[PDB]
């Protein structure tokens, strides 16, 4: 609504400025306004959208984890009762986090996914849909936790299936999707074996395709492959 009176190109130009200023909340609002213009996003605009919310939500997740750890320590045997403040403030941060995830999932469903027919757009948006359901799952504790997890799984799975059919094993989006789906396996779905196998198979298949790349594509793919390697090193 709020960015309704600004030109699409102006909102894009301003998202890039807000990125430069590390003003990620602003960046995210500008890109939400740009999506709400109703036109499809270019590659670079998809990247701006994803970086804006990634940073916003990444700050909320880190805060929620600081607060969750405090809360847990207060619930330990021998801890002094300090009343409801930690739980209230964790719940506040948690609610704001869920609101951001719902807003991104809303933009995806209305109407980015349905108009995305190329592999690179459609896999990109489905990966984001898996990511934001995953951030939901990180804080979920009630009746819907299983459905949240399975919505993350299903979105990552359809992205995987398209990426396997339509993209080279070294494509950065294919590689980043597999990195995140492997994290989902490891710490959300309690399947560390699947997490490891996925990261390993993904890394190995990318290695064998490096030879097809220019030096700049090489750089782009190996950057992500290292994050796969970092996880395998941590997990094994």
């Amino acid at each position: 609504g709020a960015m309704g009176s600004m030109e699409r190109a102006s909102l894009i130009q301003k998202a890039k400025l807000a990125e430069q200023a590390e003003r990620y909340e602003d960046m995210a609002a500008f890109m939400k306004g740009a999506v709400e213009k109703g036109e499809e996003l270019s590659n670079e605009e998809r990247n701006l959208l994803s970086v804006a919310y990634k940073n916003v939500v990444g700050g909320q997740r880190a805060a929620w984890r600081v607060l969750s750890s405090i809360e847990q320590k207060s619930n330990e045997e021998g801890s002094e009762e300090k009343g409801p403040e930690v739980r209230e403030y964790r719940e506040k941060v948690e609610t704001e986090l869920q609101g951001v995830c719902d807003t991104v999932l809303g933009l995806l469903d209305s109407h980015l996914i349905k108009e995305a027919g190329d592999a690179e757009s459609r896999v990109f948006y489905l990966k984001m849909k898996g990511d934001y359901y995953r951030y939901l799952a990180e804080v979920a504790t009630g009746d819907d936790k299983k459905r949240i997890i399975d919505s993350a799984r299903s979105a990552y799975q359809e992205a995987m299936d398209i990426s396997k059919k339509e993209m080279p094993p070294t494509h950065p989006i294919r590689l980043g999707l597999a990195l995140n789906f492997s994290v989902f396996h490891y710490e959300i779905a309690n399947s560390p074996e699947e997490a490891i196998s996925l990261a390993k198979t993904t890394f190995d298949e990318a290695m064998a395709d490096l030879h097809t790349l220019s030096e700049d594509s090489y750089k782009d793919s190996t950057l992500i492959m290292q994050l796969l390697r970092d996880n395998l090193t941590l997990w094994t």
Partner: peptide, 6 residues
């Protein structure tokens, strides 16, 4: 230290 995502 913390696993990577992107």
């Amino acid at each position: 230290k913390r696993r990577k995502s992107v």
